[PDB]
Amino acid sequence: KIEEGKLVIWINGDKGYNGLAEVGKKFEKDTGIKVTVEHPDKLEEKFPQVAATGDGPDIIFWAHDRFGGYAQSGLLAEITPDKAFQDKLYPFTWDAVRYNGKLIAYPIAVEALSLIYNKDLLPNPPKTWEEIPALDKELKAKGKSALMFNLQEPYFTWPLIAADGGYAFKYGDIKDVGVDNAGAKAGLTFLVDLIKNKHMNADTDYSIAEAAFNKGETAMTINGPWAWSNIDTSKVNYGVTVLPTFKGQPSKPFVGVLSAGINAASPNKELAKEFLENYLLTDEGLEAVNKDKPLGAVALKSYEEELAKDPRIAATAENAAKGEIMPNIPQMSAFWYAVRTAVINAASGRQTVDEALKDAQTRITK
Ligand SMILES: OC[C@H]1O[C@H](O[C@H]2[C@H](O)[C@@H](O)[C@@H](O)O[C@@H]2CO)[C@H](O)[C@@H](O)[C@@H]1O
Ligand SMILES: [Zn+2]
């Protein structure tokens, strides 16, 4: 079971878990309460597994879309922030972590994907998806490829799929699923054509794409704020801008609010509330993590009005506006699992675009 008199936190491997472990150090120095940060694999799936038996971390971090499912399963404790405290964050951030009338988590940062490009290789990144193939051809003269990004996680391909009309649950309505409509078919087909014509490889994942771009072999990649620090290290002269358009329509990334929830079975809920409100959700707490791995547009009114002036952050916000905040309903997990399978199947050749999205639609509704 969950150890008392201590705090165990789970945050994803691509986040600043050191910047966090640091915030924990202060907490410990100030309370004698040790704080352990971990980033297990598939934690979004492992958490509900162990929390269901009363185990798991005291605090779990993840985009808000997975929390509705957790709250539904009674795995999250209700959080008690002062009306004053919840006045420090934007009303839209709180709505993200609100399920059936209850606030089930603490909003941390707003995440949206952006087009990241190499300024030296491409002083002027493309505005449309359509011109990328030609650009890839011309970049051969420099021994480079045009674009590389994670094709294994639907989160990354969804912006293109939803550009021409694809959608999950229309503004949260589970009876309205659009993963297999015309827009979705157009988007995915473009991606598969890019692969068939050798402009991209279906096997490209997060690691390969990040190395390819950071090692300066590819002129562009698609990723969130957490990827910037590593690029900074690479010394690549990069820029962050708006995602390309498809069929004239802007890419629509699914926007996620990194959030921290408290395990319903935790005997340390008091220590967790303290840590999160007075040690993390401050202007300095977020900074400590932001410096490790950028968070993006934070939920904290005070800090976001500070940032947002950052070019990269402003671009993040721009893309977020053209996209959509993610549902938080329990059904989101089935949606992702279905689209994940469909994108990999269509991209690998296992299935045609039509068959892939059809099956995805079925996995979701039937
Ligand atoms: O790909 C499906 C996946 O998308 C989102 O996960 C994001 C996460 O929100 C980001 O913070 C970052 O870590 O990249 C992840 C993609 O690998 C959804 O939040 C998640 O539920 C979904 O399974
Ligand atoms: Zn071509």
Side-chain angles (χ1 to χ4, degrees):
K1 48 197 147 190
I2 305 177
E3 260 194 65
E4 86 80 42
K6 170 189 179 185
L7 281 183
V8 173
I9 307 187
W10 281 9
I11 191 164
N12 197 45
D14 54 5
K15 313 300 183 176
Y17 51 83
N18 284 155
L20 183 60
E22 283 179 56
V23 173
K25 290 303 177 182
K26 289 192 172 185
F27 189 82
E28 172 162 47
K29 178 181 179 182
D30 286 46
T31 62
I33 295 302
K34 181 179 181 182
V35 181
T36 296
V37 177
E38 312 182 319
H39 46 75
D41 209 298
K42 297 187 179 185
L43 84 83
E44 80 273 30
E45 299 186 337
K46 289 186 186 177
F47 175 71
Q49 283 176 49
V50 302
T53 48
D55 299 298
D58 299 271
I59 299 176
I60 176 197
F61 281 71
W62 196 268
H64 76 284
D65 65 304
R66 293 273 171 162
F67 289 67
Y70 303 161
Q72 181 91 303
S73 297
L75 312 176
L76 304 173
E78 171 173 40
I79 58 176
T80 59
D82 296 313
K83 165 195 171 180
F85 188 88
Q86 74 185 75
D87 270 317
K88 302 185 186 175
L89 314 186
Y90 309 73
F92 87 91
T93 191
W94 283 115
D95 305 329
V97 297
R98 191 193 313 292
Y99 189 69
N100 285 317
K102 298 180 187 178
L103 298 176
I104 62 181
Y106 286 94
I108 305 303
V110 181
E111 316 177 331
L113 292 164
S114 279
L115 179 62
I116 305 177
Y117 66 108
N118 189 316
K119 286 185 171 177
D120 295 338
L121 295 180
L122 286 180
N124 297 291
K127 287 305 183 180
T128 78
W129 272 91
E130 291 83 347
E131 67 193 281
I132 294 184
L135 184 67
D136 188 59
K137 288 171 155 296
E138 76 166 54
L139 285 171
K140 294 298 151 175
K142 301 181 178 180
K144 313 299 181 180
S145 61
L147 173 73
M148 284 190 73
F149 67 104
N150 194 2
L151 294 186
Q152 312 308 304
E153 285 290 352
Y155 179 71
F156 298 87
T157 50
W158 188 252
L160 176 54
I161 291 169
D164 190 51
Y167 61 77
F169 309 109
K170 197 55 172 184
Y171 299 159
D173 184 353
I174 71 91
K175 299 181 180 175
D176 188 16
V177 176
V179 304
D180 176 42
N181 57 30
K185 296 172 170 298
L188 188 54
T189 292
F190 188 70
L191 178 63
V192 181
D193 281 337
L194 288 179
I195 294 174
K196 288 175 176 174
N197 288 160
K198 306 301 173 178
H199 293 302
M200 292 200 329
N201 306 307
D203 63 296
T204 303
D205 63 359
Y206 191 97
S207 294
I208 299 168
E210 178 178 54
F213 180 84
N214 292 183
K215 285 180 61 190
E217 316 177 319
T218 195
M220 310 182 283
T221 194
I222 293 175
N223 226 317
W226 56 84
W228 307 340
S229 67
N230 273 14
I231 306 178
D232 291 320
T233 304
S234 78
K235 298 299 182 179
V236 177
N237 185 43
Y238 72 106
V240 181
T241 189
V242 196
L243 293 163
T245 57
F246 177 53
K247 283 186 172 302
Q249 301 309 307
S251 289
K252 307 168 59 55
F254 243 147
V255 173
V257 177
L258 180 65
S259 304
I262 292 174
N263 198 319
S266 172
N268 312 295
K269 304 203 179 68
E270 287 306 292
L271 300 171
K273 170 186 182 186
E274 172 70 356
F275 175 79
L276 293 179
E277 302 185 330
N278 307 319
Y279 284 65
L280 179 62
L281 278 175
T282 62
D283 275 295
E284 176 52 57
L286 306 178
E287 280 188 57
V289 179
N290 195 66
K291 285 187 174 174
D292 177 358
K293 292 293 185 302
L295 293 163
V298 293
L300 192 49
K301 271 173 177 167
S302 62
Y303 196 28
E304 186 45 19
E305 48 186 294
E306 174 193 299
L307 303 179
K309 291 173 185 172
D310 178 322
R312 308 176 300 174
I313 302 297
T316 299
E318 203 188 323
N319 282 306
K322 291 164 176 172
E324 283 187 44
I325 299 288
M326 293 186 287
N328 82 352
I329 63 178
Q331 296 75 203
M332 286 301 288
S333 48
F335 159 70
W336 287 125
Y337 168 76
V339 176
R340 174 180 293 111
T341 299
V343 175
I344 291 173
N345 278 2
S348 70
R350 225 102 56 187
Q351 296 186 292
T352 74
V353 173
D354 288 313
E355 307 174 311
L357 294 185
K358 183 205 310 163
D359 284 356
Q361 186 80 13
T362 301
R363 318 272 258 234
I364 294 171
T365 62
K366 308 182 181 184

